Design a protein around this ligand. Structure first.
Ligand code: NA
Ligand code: NA
Ligand code: NA
Ligand SMILES: [Zn+2]
Ligand SMILES: [Zn+2]
Ligand SMILES: [Zn+2]
Ligand SMILES: [Zn+2]
Lengths: 188, 189
DNA sequence: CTCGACGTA
DNA sequence: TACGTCGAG
């Protein structure tokens, strides 16, 4: 084992479950200091409790994949199929089904969905997105969606799919949106 | 013949409105209509002879012509850049035409700014923490990184994840729209 | 040309 | 299952 190499935990290590991926940060004769990426825990682990892994033989094309949140090595079927590439191969979400539970949160409720459906822009109407302010023809030059708050399950507004999928990149969280603002202003 | 809510194109130049500009009929008066031309958001009185009805559902993917999502001019499919492929193997073009993409793309990252960013590039297979979303990742394995740049100046910003980069673009790299997002979210918290 | 990623339908 | 969309590679 060398510094910068990747390993998995062979067994439960305190808070660290087996198959948790870590990077070697220091080595001595019998142990490594390992940063387990999911929990951001740096631990002294005996070599006998670690197994080297080839990170480039994980993910698309392979039988196992490292989750981008928990950074645990899991079977491919532990991740939801989400897209298809130009070669016809299926792409799964980068976060495993367990981690997706926290991301997805509470679904839009039936009664909130009905409230939104009562005021839905008709297909083929001219719509202006309340966020990005772009005009579109509904279902022709932009697709619209029922946005909802995933902490409460309550509806928000009809918005374009582009904006909705943008919100998700920043975790529907004003904290990260404020970080984006500061970042952009720094390089104005 | 023409009805309110029908879609038309300008056959010819109508003041500021170029041919093939898509409009929606907003009022009808004998044989003239008040047409909202969507690209420029201009409401104009137009004689029926200057308009051609179009079927918006026989435009876009699968068809010869497509309406641009910015200028809302009806253009040939090749006026839009191929960008993706769907599950059925069909090619998807960007919703904005090549002309409108010029203004979205702005100034490209300069060669010296690129070389500069390349000298501080996170190594492939290193553990990286995105400066925007704060998510830890393994470079090129659990997240892909990109050279982000300011498209007003052509200068580099930072190495960020592709997810964040493509989020910035959805809001036009413009703090104005990010502020709108904040107030929208706050409103429903 | 090709890419993954998001919350949706 | 699948979708378009973004700045990228
Ligand atoms: Na590989
Ligand atoms: Na949403
Ligand atoms: Na960018
Ligand atoms: Zn996970
Ligand atoms: Zn929008
Ligand atoms: Zn255009
Ligand atoms: Zn990020």
């Amino acid at each position: 084992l060398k510094n910068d190499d990747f390993v998995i935990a062979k067994n439960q290590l305190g808070n660290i479950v087996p198959n948790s991926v870590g990077v070697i940060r220091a080595v001595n004769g019998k142990s490594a200091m390992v940063l387990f990426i999911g929990l951001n825990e740096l631990k002294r682990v005996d070599f006998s409790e670690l197994e080297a892994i080839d990170i480039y033989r994980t993910g698309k094309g392979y039988d196992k994949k490292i989750c981008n949140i928990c950074h645990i090595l899991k079977n491919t079927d532990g991740f939801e199929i989400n897209q298809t590439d130009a070669k016809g191969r299926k792409t799964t979400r980068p976060s495993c089904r367990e981690c997706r539970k926290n991301i997805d949160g509470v679904k839009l409720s039936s009664t909130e969905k009905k409230k939104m459906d009562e005021i839905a822009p008709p297909k083929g109407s001219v719509f202006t997105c309340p966020i990005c302010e772009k005009r579109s023809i509904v279902g022709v030059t932009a697709n619209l969606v029922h946005d909802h708050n995933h902490d409460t399950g309550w509806g928000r507004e009809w918005i374009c799919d582009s904006c909705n999928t943008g919100l998700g990149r920043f975790k529907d969280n004003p904290k990260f949106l404020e970080k984006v603002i500061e970042y952009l202003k720094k390089y104005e």
